[PDB]
Write a protein that binds this ligand. Structure first.
Ligand SMILES: [Ca+2]
Ligand SMILES: [Ca+2]
Ligand SMILES: [Ca+2]
Length: 481
């Protein structure tokens, strides 16, 4: 059976935005008020959130901002699965909120963490939402040399003893742009300052290959003109390669009918670097936001060349016309919803490929009538063993993410606050519940999932907290592969 093995408190001081939702014009224009609750522009929970948990050998690395509203420091915690002990590092940087307005919480601005399995360096990317040298902070700090925020460690830092797991392991900014003695934020990953390359970036997400190569991808640009860029860590050189575009910017002048933006995620799946995404075209049409569903994979271990669509055909690279990578048109799921903005696709998209080559993609497609969602359609698109017909069904529960281990795919979530796992054989839509925490166990408000070596690492926010400091836990659940 799937079994809970460990439950570990991470902190009682995780930052939470305990105020109310603010519009973007509100967030940009309103001044701070002392004693205010911590308002927010998007979500209210920045911890656990983003690419915030990784497992390397016997270490679980977890990031979070610390509360409350006057603190907001970037934190890195390492739990040792062999000793049961944890150690945390406080970084000088504090969450800068919405475009420098640090009293408005900004859940885009996560802290991503990765370990290089080659040289055991630690990498952190944090507090970014497409900032640039001329981002207007409204009088809240100088961002001209701080629009891209990277911290990294000495080689070997991942495995030092707890008492040595300190800021001493991390490398200061000693460039000509350095702020001084506690500046751990680097404006580049390549050793070369490059505003074209490192501005307008959002959503840091690392992934690793079988052989221990480490990669990063981010979104560059805007919701009207956006691309995914990705690079590779060069352990032998102590730096990263130049960002490479999966798709172009300015597609409207390079072969597509119009510029577009890309909503998806690259992952390492069944031994290959791949991407699944949806497109936002911003045409005045039936699509309030995103349209389509797309997927491509690379047969190149570096992920740079040999990109193909699900049929195995080479695609243009960098991609200009998303339809080369088409798998499904979610507008089809509401075939009579033809009025302006009547098909609303704003989230709920995910994908995976199992170790047997089964391709799986999920989506949420909403019907939008008089400015309200009146129908929610969940889809599951899947191809057994990478061949044959692509099956799409709407007989799928309200799940927003898919995971994989062994021959299976998994839905993992919270039901009445308690973690559950549903499992299906890859290449199928036949889920059964195989784990549900028992009555009397704790209740959680939010969790992020990391699958590693046949185990589920569930990084969880405990429900029922008050104020801007809350309690997070780590659960380690054996998937019994
Ligand atoms: Ca700096
Ligand atoms: Ca549109
Ligand atoms: Ca097999």
């Amino acid at each position: 059976a799937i079994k809970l093995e460990h439950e570990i408190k991470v902190t009682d001081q995780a930052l939470f935005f305990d105020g109310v939702k603010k519009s973007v014009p509100q967030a940009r224009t309103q001044a701070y008020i002392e004693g205010q609750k911590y308002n927010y522009a998007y979500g209210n929970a920045i911890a656990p959130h983003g690419d915030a948990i990784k497992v390397y050998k016997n270490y679980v690395f977890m990031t979070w901002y610390r509360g409350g509203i006057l603190d907001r420091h970037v934190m890195l915690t390492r739990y040792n699965t062999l000793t049961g002990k944890s150690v945390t590092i406080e970084f000088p940087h504090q969450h800068t909120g919405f475009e420098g307005r640090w009293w408005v919480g900004e859940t885009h601005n996560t802290i991503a963490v990765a370990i290089s399995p080659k040289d055991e360096t630690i990498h952190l990317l944090y507090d970014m939402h497409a900032y640039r040298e001329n981002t207007d902070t409204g009088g809240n700090g100088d961002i001209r040399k701080d629009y891209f925020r990277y911290s990294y460690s000495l080689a070997g830092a991942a495995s030092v003893t707890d008492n040595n797991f300190t800021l001493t392991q991390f490398v200061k900014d000693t460039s000509v742009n350095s702020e001084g003695a506690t500046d751990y934020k680097h404006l580049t990953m390549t050793g070369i300052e490059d505003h074209g390359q490192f501005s307008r970036l959002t959503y840091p997400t690392f992934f690793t290959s079988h052989d221990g190569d480490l990669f990063l991808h981010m979104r560059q640009g805007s919701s009207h003109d956006g691309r995914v860029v990705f690079n590779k860590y060069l352990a032998e050189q102590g730096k990263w390669s130049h960002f490479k575009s999966f798709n172009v910017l300015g597609a409207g002048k390079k072969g597509e009918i119009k510029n577009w933006s890309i909503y998806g995620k690259m992952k390492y799946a069944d031994g290959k670097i791949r991407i699944g995404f949806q497109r936002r075209f911003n045409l005045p049409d039936r699509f309030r936001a995103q349209d389509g569903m797309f997927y491509a994979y690379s047969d190149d271990p570096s992920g740079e060349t040999q990109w193909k669509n699900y049929k195995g055909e080479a695609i243009t690279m960098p991609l200009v016309k998303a339809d080369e990578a088409l798998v499904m048109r979610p507008g089809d799921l509401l075939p009579d919803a033809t009025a302006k903005d009547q098909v609303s696709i704003t989230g709920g998209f995910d994908w995976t490929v199992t170790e047997n080559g089964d391709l799986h993609l999920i989506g949420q497609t909403n019907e939008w009538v008089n400015k309200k969602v009146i129908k929610k359609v969940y889809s599951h698109t899947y191809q057994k063993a990478g061949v044959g017909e692509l099956i799409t069904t709407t007989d799928f529960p309200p799940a927003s993410q898919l995971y994989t281990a062994g021959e299976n795919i998994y839905i993992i979530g919270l039901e009445q606050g308690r973690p559950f796992v549903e499992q299906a054989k890859g290449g199928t839509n036949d889920f059964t519940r195989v784990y549900y925490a028992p009555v009397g166990s704790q209740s959680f408000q939010k969790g992020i999932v990391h699958i590693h070596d046949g185990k589920l690492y569930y990084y969880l926010l405990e429900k029922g907290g008050a104020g801007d400091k809350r309690t997070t836990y780590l659960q380690i659940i054996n998937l019994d592969i």
